[PDB]
Design an enzyme around this catalytic site. Structure first.
Site, PDB file in Angstrom:
ATOM      1  N   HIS A  80      -7.461   3.093  -5.909  1.00  0.00           N
ATOM      2  CA  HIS A  80      -6.168   2.534  -5.517  1.00  0.00           C
ATOM      3  C   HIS A  80      -5.173   3.612  -5.164  1.00  0.00           C
ATOM      4  O   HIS A  80      -4.207   3.804  -5.895  1.00  0.00           O
ATOM      5  CB  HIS A  80      -5.596   1.519  -6.644  1.00  0.00           C
ATOM      6  CG  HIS A  80      -6.399   0.255  -6.709  1.00  0.00           C
ATOM      7  ND1 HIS A  80      -7.457   0.065  -7.537  1.00  0.00           N
ATOM      8  CD2 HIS A  80      -6.254  -0.917  -6.019  1.00  0.00           C
ATOM      9  CE1 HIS A  80      -7.960  -1.143  -7.358  1.00  0.00           C
ATOM     10  NE2 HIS A  80      -7.251  -1.771  -6.427  1.00  0.00           N
ATOM     11  N   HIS A 120       0.746  -2.628  -0.321  1.00  0.00           N
ATOM     12  CA  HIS A 120       0.361  -3.638  -1.274  1.00  0.00           C
ATOM     13  C   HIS A 120      -0.165  -3.163  -2.607  1.00  0.00           C
ATOM     14  O   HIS A 120      -0.297  -3.988  -3.510  1.00  0.00           O
ATOM     15  CB  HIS A 120      -0.664  -4.576  -0.725  1.00  0.00           C
ATOM     16  CG  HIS A 120      -2.063  -4.051  -0.758  1.00  0.00           C
ATOM     17  ND1 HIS A 120      -2.635  -3.321   0.222  1.00  0.00           N
ATOM     18  CD2 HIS A 120      -3.010  -4.163  -1.716  1.00  0.00           C
ATOM     19  CE1 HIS A 120      -3.895  -3.018  -0.154  1.00  0.00           C
ATOM     20  NE2 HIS A 120      -4.151  -3.526  -1.323  1.00  0.00           N
ATOM     21  N   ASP A 121      -0.477  -1.865  -2.745  1.00  0.00           N
ATOM     22  CA  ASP A 121      -0.952  -1.311  -4.012  1.00  0.00           C
ATOM     23  C   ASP A 121      -0.053  -0.150  -4.474  1.00  0.00           C
ATOM     24  O   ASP A 121      -0.455   0.691  -5.276  1.00  0.00           O
ATOM     25  CB  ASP A 121      -2.430  -0.852  -4.002  1.00  0.00           C
ATOM     26  CG  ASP A 121      -3.426  -1.936  -4.263  1.00  0.00           C
ATOM     27  OD1 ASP A 121      -3.119  -2.811  -5.116  1.00  0.00           O
ATOM     28  OD2 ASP A 121      -4.509  -1.938  -3.657  1.00  0.00           O
ATOM     29  N   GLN A 285     -22.401  -5.233  -7.598  1.00  0.00           N
ATOM     30  CA  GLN A 285     -21.922  -5.383  -6.203  1.00  0.00           C
ATOM     31  C   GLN A 285     -22.514  -6.613  -5.553  1.00  0.00           C
ATOM     32  O   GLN A 285     -21.811  -7.300  -4.816  1.00  0.00           O
ATOM     33  CB  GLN A 285     -22.240  -4.122  -5.377  1.00  0.00           C
ATOM     34  CG  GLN A 285     -21.425  -2.880  -5.683  1.00  0.00           C
ATOM     35  CD  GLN A 285     -19.965  -3.069  -5.415  1.00  0.00           C
ATOM     36  OE1 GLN A 285     -19.253  -3.650  -6.244  1.00  0.00           O
ATOM     37  NE2 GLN A 285     -19.476  -2.604  -4.295  1.00  0.00           N
TER      38      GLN A 285
HETATM   39  C1  LIG Z   1      -9.483  -4.887  -7.788  1.00  0.00           C
HETATM   40  C2  LIG Z   1     -10.690  -4.356  -7.051  1.00  0.00           C
HETATM   41  C3  LIG Z   1     -11.384  -5.359  -6.047  1.00  0.00           C
HETATM   42  C4  LIG Z   1     -12.479  -4.700  -5.347  1.00  0.00           C
HETATM   43  N1  LIG Z   1     -12.393  -4.119  -4.128  1.00  0.00           N
HETATM   44  N2  LIG Z   1     -13.582  -3.597  -3.759  1.00  0.00           N
HETATM   45  C5  LIG Z   1     -13.826  -2.904  -2.509  1.00  0.00           C
HETATM   46  C6  LIG Z   1     -14.505  -3.832  -4.760  1.00  0.00           C
HETATM   47  C7  LIG Z   1     -15.880  -3.494  -4.858  1.00  0.00           C
HETATM   48  O1  LIG Z   1     -16.575  -2.888  -4.045  1.00  0.00           O
HETATM   49  N3  LIG Z   1     -16.438  -3.933  -6.062  1.00  0.00           N
HETATM   50  C8  LIG Z   1     -15.704  -4.623  -7.022  1.00  0.00           C
HETATM   51  C9  LIG Z   1     -16.521  -4.990  -8.196  1.00  0.00           C
HETATM   52  C10 LIG Z   1     -16.361  -6.334  -8.576  1.00  0.00           C
HETATM   53  C11 LIG Z   1     -17.054  -6.885  -9.669  1.00  0.00           C
HETATM   54  S1  LIG Z   1     -16.845  -8.538 -10.131  1.00  0.00           S
HETATM   55  O2  LIG Z   1     -16.782  -9.377  -9.055  1.00  0.00           O
HETATM   56  O3  LIG Z   1     -17.816  -8.843 -11.088  1.00  0.00           O
HETATM   57  N4  LIG Z   1     -15.388  -8.610 -10.833  1.00  0.00           N
HETATM   58  C12 LIG Z   1     -14.932  -7.622 -11.772  1.00  0.00           C
HETATM   59  C13 LIG Z   1     -13.471  -7.207 -11.505  1.00  0.00           C
HETATM   60  N5  LIG Z   1     -12.604  -8.371 -11.574  1.00  0.00           N
HETATM   61  C14 LIG Z   1     -11.198  -8.046 -11.475  1.00  0.00           C
HETATM   62  C15 LIG Z   1     -13.039  -9.479 -10.725  1.00  0.00           C
HETATM   63  C16 LIG Z   1     -14.552  -9.786 -10.853  1.00  0.00           C
HETATM   64  C17 LIG Z   1     -17.905  -6.039 -10.352  1.00  0.00           C
HETATM   65  C18 LIG Z   1     -18.067  -4.746  -9.988  1.00  0.00           C
HETATM   66  C19 LIG Z   1     -17.368  -4.192  -8.887  1.00  0.00           C
HETATM   67  O4  LIG Z   1     -17.459  -2.950  -8.461  1.00  0.00           O
HETATM   68  C20 LIG Z   1     -18.474  -2.048  -9.026  1.00  0.00           C
HETATM   69  C21 LIG Z   1     -18.389  -0.784  -8.255  1.00  0.00           C
HETATM   70  N6  LIG Z   1     -14.432  -4.954  -6.960  1.00  0.00           N
HETATM   71  C22 LIG Z   1     -13.841  -4.531  -5.790  1.00  0.00           C
HETATM   72 MG   LIG Z   2      -3.966  -4.658  -5.673  1.00  0.00          MG
HETATM   73 ZN   LIG Z   3      -5.761  -3.349  -2.716  1.00  0.00          ZN
END
Ligand SMILES: CCCc1nn(C)c2c(=O)[nH]c(-c3cc(S(=O)(=O)N4CCN(C)CC4)ccc3OCC)nc12
Ligand SMILES: [Mg+2]
Ligand SMILES: [Zn+2]
Length: 326
Positions: A80, A120-121, A285
């Site tokens: 971020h 936004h961040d 992912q």
């Molecule tokens: C706030 C970050 C949102 C986000 N952006 N991007 C590009 C990603 C990404 O590539 N992966 C994940 C990610 C999500 C989950 S999730 O869908 O299971 N998830 C966990 C986080 N919360 C806030 C929502 C649900 C689990 C693992 C992740 O990244 C591992 C590298 N979040 C984001």
């Molecule tokens: Mg954000």
């Molecule tokens: Zn963002």
């Protein structure tokens, strides 16, 4: 003075064409660009969306505003940071141009969306809303535990738009200035994934029923929210080498939060926040793609078929992660 020296390198540099900078490409990567080059690309986005012209922005003021936004991201936060904001804005630009969304929106809406994407961040601390709630953060107290980070980023957005010499909205009517700040607030709050999950079903239902209509103001606001999330998450659509690198940044930030949890709260982090579990990133992912991303990019492609590359890239990365999960 280091700040004046950056402003002068920037306001006197030639701004290359959008074609030269590759910013119209959904597949765009920022990794090879210097900070100065990302700033030039941002100027090019405002110029080619006709914002500099339609809203009479002075060059020096836009330059100053862009450098203020950049400086107000925390460079030490792994994901971020300014590059994520810049990439989010670049995706917005590509969606509007290559994706043909520009013609479906007003200049005022585009103006708000671009500023919102970049802002936004702002000042993201590298921890989640849930961490801010759990630690009784002053931010969470101020905002009553509701979209805590996003209220903070909006506050920071307003602070910059109001700082001397950074007033890029000065050419607007008072009524349009107010309307634009309201759209910016809605756009930044929309990037809270909790709000995305609450609202997506209505969007999907309208598309399924063949009833989605951007002329309806409520549906337009819903669309703008969905578009903000699509741009915010767009690293998941990028060419595989770029996605693999960005995923490593996301995991670095999550693991750093887990390290803070283990020391500041005396709790055991969940697998997502536990570096011991790095081997689970491919499965995580795939789960992220399935639960959040795929249907969003599918839905966006219904609104504009020219946004298909985003969906295509998301599906390609799902295959790549799934192969590593097995
Ligand atoms: C706030 C970050 C949102 C986000 N952006 N991007 C590009 C990603 C990404 O590539 N992966 C994940 C990610 C999500 C989950 S999730 O869908 O299971 N998830 C966990 C986080 N919360 C806030 C929502 C649900 C689990 C693992 C992740 O990244 C591992 C590298 N979040 C984001
Ligand atoms: Mg954000
Ligand atoms: Zn963002």
């Amino acid at each position: 003075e280091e700040e004046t020296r950056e402003l002068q390198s920037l306001a006197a540099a030639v701004v290359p064409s959008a074609q030269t900078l590759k910013i119209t490409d959904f597949s765009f990567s920022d990794f090879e660009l210097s900070d100065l080059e990302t700033a030039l690309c941002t100027i090019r986005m405002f110029t080619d969306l006709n914002l500099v012209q339609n809203f009479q922005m002075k060059h020096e003021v836009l330059c100053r505003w862009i450098l203020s936004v950049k400086k107000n991201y925390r460079k030490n936060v792994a994901y971020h940071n300014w590059r994520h904001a810049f990439n989010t804005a670049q995706c917005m630009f590509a969606a509007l141009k290559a994706g043909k969304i520009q013609n479906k929106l007003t200049d005022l809406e585009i103006l708000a969306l671009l500023i919102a994407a970049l802002s936004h961040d702002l000042d993201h601390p590298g921890v989640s809303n849930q961490f801010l709630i759990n630690t009784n953060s002053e931010l969470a107290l101020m905002y009553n535990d509701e979209s805590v980070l996003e209220h903070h980023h909006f506050d920071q957005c307003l602070m910059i738009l109001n700082s001397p010499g950074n007033q890029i909205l000065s050419g607007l009517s008072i009524e349009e200035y107010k309307t634009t700040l309201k759209i910016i607030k809605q756009a930044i709050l929309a990037t809270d994934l909790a709000l995305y999950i609450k609202r997506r079903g209505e969007f999907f239902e309208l598309i399924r029923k063949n009833q989605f209509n951007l002329e309806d103001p409520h549906q337009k606001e819903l669309f703008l929210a969905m578009l903000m999330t699509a741009c915010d998450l767009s690293a998941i659509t990028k060419p595989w080498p770029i996605q693999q690198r960005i995923a490593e940044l996301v995991a670095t930030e999550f693991f750093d939060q887990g390290d803070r949890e283990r020391k500041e709260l005396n709790i055991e982090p969940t697998d997502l926040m536990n570096r011991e579990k790095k081997n689970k990133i491919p499965s995580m992912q795939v789960g992220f793609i399935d639960a959040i991303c795929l249907q969003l990019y599918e839905a966006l492609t219904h609104v504009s078929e020219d946004c298909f590359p985003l969906l295509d890239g998301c599906r390609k990365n799902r295959q790549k992660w799934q192969a590593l999960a097995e």
